[PDB]
Design an enzyme around this catalytic site. Sequence first.
Site, PDB file in Angstrom:
ATOM      1  CG  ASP A 288      -1.785   1.267   1.262  1.00  0.00           C
ATOM      2  OD1 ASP A 288      -2.549   1.487   0.296  1.00  0.00           O
ATOM      3  OD2 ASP A 288      -1.706   2.024   2.254  1.00  0.00           O
ATOM      4  CG  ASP A 290      -0.772   6.804   3.415  1.00  0.00           C
ATOM      5  OD1 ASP A 290      -1.086   7.865   2.814  1.00  0.00           O
ATOM      6  OD2 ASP A 290      -1.154   6.538   4.573  1.00  0.00           O
ATOM      7  CD  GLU A 292      -1.039  10.836   4.272  1.00  0.00           C
ATOM      8  OE1 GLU A 292      -1.067  11.796   5.067  1.00  0.00           O
ATOM      9  OE2 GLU A 292      -1.713   9.808   4.458  1.00  0.00           O
ATOM     10  CE1 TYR A 367      -8.178   9.812   6.472  1.00  0.00           C
ATOM     11  CE2 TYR A 367      -9.755   8.008   6.365  1.00  0.00           C
ATOM     12  CZ  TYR A 367      -8.452   8.467   6.303  1.00  0.00           C
ATOM     13  OH  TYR A 367      -7.423   7.576   6.072  1.00  0.00           O
TER      14      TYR A 367
HETATM   15  C1  LIG Z   1      -8.844  16.839   2.605  1.00  0.00           C
HETATM   16  C2  LIG Z   1      -7.847  17.952   2.653  1.00  0.00           C
HETATM   17  O1  LIG Z   1      -7.219  18.256   1.697  1.00  0.00           O
HETATM   18  N1  LIG Z   1      -7.689  18.570   3.796  1.00  0.00           N
HETATM   19  C3  LIG Z   1      -6.406  18.635   4.433  1.00  0.00           C
HETATM   20  C4  LIG Z   1      -6.162  17.500   5.374  1.00  0.00           C
HETATM   21  O2  LIG Z   1      -6.171  16.351   4.597  1.00  0.00           O
HETATM   22  C5  LIG Z   1      -4.817  17.693   6.068  1.00  0.00           C
HETATM   23  O3  LIG Z   1      -4.650  16.843   7.179  1.00  0.00           O
HETATM   24  C6  LIG Z   1      -3.899  15.699   6.888  1.00  0.00           C
HETATM   25  O4  LIG Z   1      -4.708  14.769   6.243  1.00  0.00           O
HETATM   26  C7  LIG Z   1      -4.070  13.596   5.902  1.00  0.00           C
HETATM   27  C8  LIG Z   1      -5.006  12.719   5.126  1.00  0.00           C
HETATM   28  O5  LIG Z   1      -5.455  13.409   3.976  1.00  0.00           O
HETATM   29  C9  LIG Z   1      -3.807  12.893   7.184  1.00  0.00           C
HETATM   30  O6  LIG Z   1      -3.305  11.642   6.833  1.00  0.00           O
HETATM   31  C10 LIG Z   1      -2.796  13.708   7.930  1.00  0.00           C
HETATM   32  O7  LIG Z   1      -2.513  13.095   9.152  1.00  0.00           O
HETATM   33  C11 LIG Z   1      -3.354  15.095   8.162  1.00  0.00           C
HETATM   34  N2  LIG Z   1      -2.378  15.958   8.750  1.00  0.00           N
HETATM   35  C12 LIG Z   1      -2.644  16.576   9.868  1.00  0.00           C
HETATM   36  C13 LIG Z   1      -1.628  17.525  10.394  1.00  0.00           C
HETATM   37  O8  LIG Z   1      -3.662  16.380  10.444  1.00  0.00           O
HETATM   38  C14 LIG Z   1      -4.689  19.118   6.579  1.00  0.00           C
HETATM   39  C15 LIG Z   1      -3.270  19.485   6.820  1.00  0.00           C
HETATM   40  O9  LIG Z   1      -3.282  19.794   8.170  1.00  0.00           O
HETATM   41  O10 LIG Z   1      -5.044  20.051   5.634  1.00  0.00           O
HETATM   42  C16 LIG Z   1      -6.320  19.907   5.170  1.00  0.00           C
HETATM   43  O11 LIG Z   1      -6.430  20.858   4.175  1.00  0.00           O
END
Ligand SMILES: CC(=O)N[C@@H]1[C@@H](O)[C@H](O[C@@H]2O[C@H](CO)[C@@H](O)[C@H](O)[C@H]2NC(C)=O)[C@@H](CO)O[C@H]1O
Length: 539
Positions: A288, A290, A292, A367
């Site tokens: 998998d 992942d 990001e 999510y």
């Molecule tokens: C959906 C989107 O674009 N929103 C952003 C969040 O996704 C993002 O948080 C991060 O999301 C990742 C999964 O998509 C998680 O795996 C990761 O842990 C998470 N990071 C944090 C610090 O929570 C946040 C960035 O903070 O931004 C949003 O825009």
Amino acid sequence: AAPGKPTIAWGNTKFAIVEVDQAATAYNNLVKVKNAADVSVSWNLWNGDTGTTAKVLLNGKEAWSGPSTGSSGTANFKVNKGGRYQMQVALCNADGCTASDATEIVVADTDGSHLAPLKEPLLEKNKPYKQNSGKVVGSYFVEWGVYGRNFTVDKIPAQNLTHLLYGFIPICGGNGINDSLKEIEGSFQALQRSCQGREDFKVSIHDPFAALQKAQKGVTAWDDPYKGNFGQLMALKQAHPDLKILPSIGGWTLSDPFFFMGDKVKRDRFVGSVKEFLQTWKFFDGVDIDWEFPGGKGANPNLGSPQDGETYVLLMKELRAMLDQLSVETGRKYELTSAISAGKDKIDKVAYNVAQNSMDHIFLMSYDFYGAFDLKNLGHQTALNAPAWKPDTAYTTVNGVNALLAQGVKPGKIVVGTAMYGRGWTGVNGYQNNIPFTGTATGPVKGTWENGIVDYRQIAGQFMSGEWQYTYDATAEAPYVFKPSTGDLITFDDARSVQAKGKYVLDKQLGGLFSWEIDADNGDILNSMNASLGNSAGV
Ligand SMILES: CC(=O)N[C@@H]1[C@@H](O)[C@H](O[C@@H]2O[C@H](CO)[C@@H](O)[C@H](O)[C@H]2NC(C)=O)[C@@H](CO)O[C@H]1O
């Protein structure tokens, strides 16, 4: 007369095809893959003629033969298949063979062939389901959850899953390569020690103690060669041979190395090390990815390139070619998956309509739409639809699915995500018409383990009584709890919103549901994932 009956000498009876060095912290020294286990047996003859030929039998079949030259003997031989064997020593002469009583020996291998199945009872509110819907039901188990969270592999309700993903397998690399790790105490240093003597961009194990050496149910004996998460996952494989157990590479803080993989020299080295990892840890069923995220906006503000979309497609193609070769070498089916952002801005950095041909499943991370990372714009973190008070909401499950479909992604490739956790703010204020999301926040909600994030188990056990309001938004398909005295607001998934997601998957013919993270559920979420996808109750 035939020889006297030999007595097998007391001695070690546990051997391994993949050896684990018990005093090593570097991955290179920690594991040694061999073609076969080196086995040793000794014997004494207390009564009679020692015969002329001594033999070691495994289940009646000779594994070693030699001249019987004394009242005591020793045999050293190789065994290339894992399992448990009834071993005997036989002494033969022209008048006959005389065999000892059997002594069981254990030849360990990383498929768990030497291990009794880990069939554990369902705990908390988990109820048994049959995986007969043909839909994916997946969840991530986290390597570090065996510590403070105390959630081990024997607590996974494994029969209620098709896919169990192990977060996370790291990619070796120091300064400039894994800088995001430096934000976590001791995390960067732990990887460097694991990767000592190991080239950058090869995979490794981040916490070898948790993964391989911590005593756990079914793997507590000192000479059990595989303990920890990996040992238990091996035994779990024995209990559930149809469960797909996938190592997940990346996550929020281990994704930086992906951004360097436009260099095919590094990409080739990575893909080769994944193959070796799967040849080493045979209980794993694929890989998998992942990452990001392709294009940036992950943990590292200094990373992200317009080349990332091409790099991703190339990585998926080459991983699939490696997995196909592995598949025909072993006769096994191997899967390639990836967890991806559900935001349209990130989705359109990648041509998933091309990459999908290399991939068995896309885990759509539907999510973290909202959370304490933004105290000004509040909303449902994992809703199906936009709420009535803002139908133009950008970040919804449906909008992420629709972006993939508009690219040309086949619906059956798409696995919708559910959250076994809430995100939350504190001090919410300035909201209109009793809708707390139209206000603004002053900080994160107090978390179970970290600010702004609450285990679903704690929401159900603590924040569904007292002063907490509860509202199910039927338009968004999203529940939330609100404590007005303190402005605490938590957005999460519950059984009903998961039900709407499952029904949505069945209506649009998507691939199934997956969840993050399995330790935080009390059973309600996974129960609803199974039921709403049409899995039958029972075992
Ligand atoms: C959906 C989107 O674009 N929103 C952003 C969040 O996704 C993002 O948080 C991060 O999301 C990742 C999964 O998509 C998680 O795996 C990761 O842990 C998470 N990071 C944090 C610090 O929570 C946040 C960035 O903070 O931004 C949003 O825009």
